[PDB]
């Protein structure tokens, strides 16, 4: 990724990312946008065209009017954790909402990166028309979906294997190399998807 392309992607994200009202960590919000700018510009442009907003939050997701209906609800795959959506720091799918400061593994989740995982879900659902549930990806998932850990979540839900693999592919060179070694068919699939 050259200088102009990273800048172009940040420009696209300037039309996608929504910052919270009130006090928030501006530096960390900027760092999250910079990580999202590593995503292939084709996907970011499609998110913008679809008026998908990436909402950065300074408080709980369920304190937003549009997610209040999830109070007390246990997310898919979170059975037995003792947590509900009130405790979950990010959400992706038909919308994206993310708590600032909770990017890294261990900040209330075990994803390699919160914002890439959530945005991957939006790309899957909105841009790629649920490609993670296509026969092609289900076949890859059947072979490689238990090779990235967290097998009772990533190994059981193809959309979660897709989202986490996408996050590995786009976070940094180290995670990208790890994905290629663990899940070569998934890596090739993502490489071809971006063409």
């Amino acid at each position: 990724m050259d200088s102009t392309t990273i800048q172009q992607n940040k420009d696209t994200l300037s039309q996608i990312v929504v910052f919270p009202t009130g006090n928030y960590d501006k530096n960390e919000a900027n760092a999250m946008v910079n990580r999202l700018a590593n995503i292939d510009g084709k996907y970011l442009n499609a998110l913008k065209q679809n008026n998908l907003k990436i909402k950065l939050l300074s408080g709980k997701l369920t304190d937003e009017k549009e997610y209040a209906y999830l109070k007390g609800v246990v997310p898919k795959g979170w059975e037995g954790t003792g947590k509900t959506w009130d405790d979950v720091p990010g959400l992706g799918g038909s919308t994206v909402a993310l708590r600032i400061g909770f990017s890294n593994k261990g900040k209330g989740h075990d994803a390699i990166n919160l914002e890439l995982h959530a945005t991957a879900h939006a790309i899957d659902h909105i841009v790629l028309n649920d490609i993670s549930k296509s026969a092609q990806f289900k076949q890859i998932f059947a072979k490689e979906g238990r090779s990235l850990g967290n097998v009772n979540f990533l190994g059981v839900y193809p959309e979660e294997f897709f989202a986490e693999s996408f996050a590995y592919y786009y976070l940094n060179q180290d995670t990208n190399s790890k994905l290629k070694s663990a899940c070569p068919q998934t890596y090739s699939f993502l490489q071809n998807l971006a063409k």
């Binding site: 997310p75 795959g77 990010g90 959400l91 989740h109 075990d110 879900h121 659902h125 959309e159 979660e160």
Partner: peptide, 7 residues
């Protein structure tokens, strides 16, 4: 559709 991160 809503999806949480890895638990």
């Amino acid at each position: 559709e809503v999806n949480a991160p890895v638990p």
